[PDB]
Design an enzyme around this catalytic site. Structure first.
Site, short mmCIF file in Angstrom:
data_model
loop_
_atom_site.label_atom_id
_atom_site.label_comp_id
_atom_site.label_asym_id
_atom_site.label_seq_id
_atom_site.Cartn_x
_atom_site.Cartn_y
_atom_site.Cartn_z
N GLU A 40 0.81 -1.20 0.03
CA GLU A 40 -0.07 -0.09 0.07
C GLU A 40 0.88 1.00 0.13
O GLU A 40 0.61 2.35 -0.81
CB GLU A 40 -0.69 0.10 1.07
N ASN A 66 -7.40 10.75 -5.15
CA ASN A 66 -8.06 10.25 -6.28
C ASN A 66 -8.92 10.88 -6.81
O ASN A 66 -9.25 12.11 -6.43
CB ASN A 66 -8.97 9.22 -5.57
N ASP A 74 -12.44 10.72 -7.50
CA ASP A 74 -13.83 10.73 -6.96
C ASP A 74 -13.87 11.70 -5.92
O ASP A 74 -14.86 11.50 -5.17
CB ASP A 74 -14.20 9.24 -6.67
N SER A 105 -12.01 11.46 -3.20
CA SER A 105 -11.33 10.74 -1.94
C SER A 105 -9.86 10.76 -1.81
O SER A 105 -9.45 11.02 -3.19
CB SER A 105 -11.86 9.34 -1.81
N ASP A 136 -6.63 8.47 0.03
CA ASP A 136 -5.96 7.27 0.80
C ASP A 136 -4.87 7.65 1.38
O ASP A 136 -3.68 8.28 1.03
CB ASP A 136 -5.69 6.02 -0.19
N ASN A 179 -8.97 5.04 3.14
CA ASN A 179 -9.65 6.09 2.30
C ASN A 179 -10.75 6.78 2.91
O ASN A 179 -11.36 6.56 3.77
CB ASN A 179 -10.47 5.23 1.13
N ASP A 183 -16.26 -3.93 10.67
CA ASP A 183 -17.40 -3.58 9.76
C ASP A 183 -17.71 -4.52 8.67
O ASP A 183 -18.42 -4.38 7.92
CB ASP A 183 -17.32 -2.18 9.17
#
Length: 129
Positions: free
Chosen positions: A35, A46, A48, A50, A52, A59, A101
């Site tokens: 990563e 990114n 969109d 967002s 990271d 994210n 989650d």
């Protein structure tokens, strides 16, 4: 900070990741390697809206709040800046939340791609733990 693999392994083990929810320690070290190349400050912005963040590239849509991301859920209940610390606390706790989650490690694209199904134990081999 750029961790070494054994240093990161020891830190992750202190923070409870070895066999957390069925993921042996090497999985977590491998995910971080691919990563972020172990860089606690890694930041991928990114298209969109967002971003990271940090050693595990978590994210900002679902997990941390950066105030610029559409659809924000902030499920880790943290500012994304906490994920850029040199100390891995926030990243580990949020990684635990991702899995709590109901996500596998498959939440981490690099884990899916560079770590799933491989000899991940190699990432902790020869480390003092």
């Amino acid at each position: 900070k750029v961790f070494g693999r054994c240093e990161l392994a020891a830190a992750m083990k202190r923070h409870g990741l070895d066999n957390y929810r069925g993921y042996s320690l090497g999985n977590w070290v491998c995910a971080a390697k691919f990563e972020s190349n172990f860089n606690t400050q890694a930041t991928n912005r990114n298209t969109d809206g967002s971003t990271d963040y940090g050693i595990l590239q978590i994210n900002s849509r679902w997990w941390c709040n950066d105030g610029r991301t559409p659809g924000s859920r902030n499920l880790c209940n943290i500012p994304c800046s906490a994920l850029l610390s040199s100390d891995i606390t926030a990243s580990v706790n949020c990684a635990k939340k991702i899995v709590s989650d109901g996500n596998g490690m498959n939440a981490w694209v690099a884990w899916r791609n560079r770590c799933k199904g491989t000899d991940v134990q190699a990432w902790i081999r020869g480390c003092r733990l």
